Each structure stands twice: as structure tokens, then as C-alpha cells.
Design a protein around this ligand. Sequence first.
Ligand code: ADN
Ligand code: MG
Length: 387
Amino acid sequence: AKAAAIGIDLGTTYSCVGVFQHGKVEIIANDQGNRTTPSYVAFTDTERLIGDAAKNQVALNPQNTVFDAKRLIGRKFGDPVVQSDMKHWPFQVINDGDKPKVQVSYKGETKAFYPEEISSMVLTKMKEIAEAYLGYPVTNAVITVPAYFNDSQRQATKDAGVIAGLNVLRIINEPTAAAIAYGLDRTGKGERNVLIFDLGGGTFDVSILTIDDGIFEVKATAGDTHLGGEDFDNRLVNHFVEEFKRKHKKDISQNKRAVRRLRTACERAKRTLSSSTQASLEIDSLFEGIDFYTSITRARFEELCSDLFRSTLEPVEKALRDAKLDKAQIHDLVLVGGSTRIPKVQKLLQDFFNGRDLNKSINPDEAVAYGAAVQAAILIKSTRAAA
Ligand SMILES: Nc1ncnc2c1ncn2[C@@H]1O[C@H](CO)[C@@H](O)[C@H]1O
Ligand SMILES: [Mg+2]
């Protein structure tokens, strides 16, 4: 009779929704079969597109396709971070009372939205994905945020849930949700130190938590808000642009279609390289009707991104220093984020911890949502105590 509650990982680049029922979690696929959904919203003269449909039409509608709203949420327009990020976005960000708003063309009008309004559209889609699986309306949810988010950012995320028609049970930290997915808070009495290594599409976060009798304390947070999978895609694209120049004596960089098609093929070859030692790249008529059929080895990809992968250890060292803990004092190392599938990244972290095994038995893309779904199921319990 009681509807299930959902756990939502409201990500910078992608979001994910889960439900915990009968001792098991289901990470829910959307109608296109994807277990993760782009945190994108596109506006046209006739439609508001959310998720895959928005991301899939970004190439020709860059001014009216919004993404990265999580980088603006709960911040001031005057913030240096906001002014820097704006230089990289094709959509307009406006100033309304020292608060940023995204401005687009939508259904015949110029319209401006607060970041919480864009995130409420992403949350609306995640709610619908869950309702398609459950077969009934969903209202209760736990939403996750980065551990470094302040009160303004947490409140703006709750407001996004409220606008989406969701009752927000709690806002919980992303690394806490990942620890809950592994049941790390169920180890009973005694302090447990957990390091969460979160490398995603566009961000990198390291968090150290101490858990005692199910109570969490964030001991340190470090990372780089501008390091992730997209930076590795960028390195591959540069390598291929150079290769094309070498073979055909043409620079393909100015044709946006060629660069986009190359970037899309690069990202897929990158995924293959996590499972195979080689990946072929085949593109028909990339530039001036020339087919670009080539290959790349895992060793070459690792060389291309080597400095980026190595740089992930600096925040790990910093977090350990800030938490006042030695490497040997960390009980569990947990991998989160799609980019942690890269073998070289796992090797570097393992070597840093002198050969320690890494927790990766839960899909890295889904661990945060999984933990949020477990917490949501706990929070809606309303049993009266037996005599
Ligand atoms: N198997 C994989 N190997 C490497 N990167 C991956 C893999 N799966 C997903 N990613 C990356 O994780 C990020 C979040 O989806 C993206 O940058 C994506 O390219
Ligand atoms: Mg994330």
C-alpha cells in the first residue's frame, strides 16, 4: 500500500535513479535503455526535451540546450567560478539580483530559468523513469549532492526537488551515499575510515569519511572541479587531428561536424580500451570525403592522458593530510564515476596505497544512486514498536 521512495544521483553531466525493494536495489533504465540519463534540457519552439533527447540534438541547438546547471546552483553571478565557466558555455547566463539564470528561446519567447528550475526538469525526468518501472506515481526521494556543497547549494537542490513535485526526504552527500551502497555503515561498533575516489565525466572528487555505529563524519574533501572523462576525450581528439594532418595534409579542426564526429568516435574507442589493449576507429568521409580508418593501443591512450591520470593522486595525498590519517589507516578504498573503469587509473591508486585492493564491486556510475535508494527506503519506514 506504501509507494516505494527513490534515490536520485543528480549529477553534473548524468543522473541516475534507483529503488530498493525486497532487499535489493534496481537501478532503473530509461525508455531508451540507459541506466544513466544526461543532465541536459533543450528548448525549441514546440518542445522541452530532457535527457537523451536533449543531448542528442545539442550539435545544432547549442544556444538553447542547457547542461552543467549543477555548476551554477546556489551560487552568486559575481562568483569568479561562475564568470570563468560562462566563457565555456554556448548558452547565455544572465544576472538577476547577483544570481545566475540561463536564458533561452522557448515556445516563441525569451525565457530565463534559475539553475534550480533547470535541475527540477532533470528531476522530473528521473521521477518519470522510476514511475515507468514502478507503475504508479512516485513522490518521495533522497537526492545527493557533493560533500563540499554549502547550505545555499543544498537548499537550492531541495527547491529543485519541490518544483519537480517531489517530497525531498533528505539531501545526502554523494560519498556518504557510495559508502551506504557498500553497506559500510553496517559494520557495527568501531571507527571505519573510508576514502571515496570519484572520477566522472567532468569532475574529480576525493572524500575521506569516518563511520562509527552508522554515524558519518566528513573528515576531508579535495579534488578538481575541472578534471574528468571529457579531458581524456580532448586528448584523443588532438591526437587524431594531428594524425589526419600527417596522413592527408589537411587540418580538420575548423569543421565542427568533423570534430564532433571524431570526438564521438574517440569517446567510444576510449571505453573499448578499458577492456581491450587496442581499439579501432572507423569514420566514413570525415573531411573532404576522406575516410579515416585507424587504430589506437591502450599504451598510446595511457601516454596521451598520463599527466591527467597521475594528477588524481595529488588530491588523494592532500585529503589524507587534511584528515590527519596515514595510508594504512584507511579501511576501505571505494571507486565511483565512470572514468574509474580505466585500468591505468585503478593501477595508479592501488600502487599509491601499496597494492591495496579497491572496492569496485558496484557499478561506479550507479553507486551513488544505489546508496540514495537504500537511504530512501530506510527513511520512509513507519513501523510502530512491538511491545
Ligand atoms: N569503460 C569505460 N572506460 C572509460 N571511461 C568510461 C567508461 N565508461 C564510461 N566512461 C566515462 O565515464 C564518464 C561518465 O559517463 C564519461 O567521460 C565516459 O566516457
Ligand atoms: Mg557524479
